[PDB]
Design a protein around this nucleic acid. Structure first.
Length: 73
DNA sequence: ACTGCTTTCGCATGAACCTCCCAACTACTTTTCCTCACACTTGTACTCCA
């Protein structure tokens, strides 16, 4: 609950370095094809979101998977 | 004097206790595991007042 699945991933990418050995590349195209069909919206929002993504993004691709072995906070 | 008062004795073989523990199911602890949002600063935003 409430990022307990997420904070362990943050503790997992940090303790064992999934970063800098593997590819921490979240294929966001394979994620939002679901979210179109979850609530049955027209497929323009698949690309309407994409340019909102590609406007506000450091390094256009690759929403970064995060690593944390730093502390428990 | 004499009673009561004893004392051995028996047709032959076959055979014919009790308290505490371990019960049964209740309840009220143990044995260390994981999972984090909380205190003061500080840096960065968009105001300020001289």
């Amino acid at each position: 609950f409430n990022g307990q699945l997420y904070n362990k991933i943050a503790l997992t990418c940090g303790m064992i370095h999934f970063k800098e050995f593997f590819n921490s590349e979240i294929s966001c195209q394979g994620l939002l094809l679901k979210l179109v069909m979850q609530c049955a919206l027209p497929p323009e929002f698949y690309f309407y979101t994409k340019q909102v993504i590609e406007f506000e993004e450091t390094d256009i691709r690759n929403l970064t998977l995060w690593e944390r072995t730093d502390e428990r906070h």
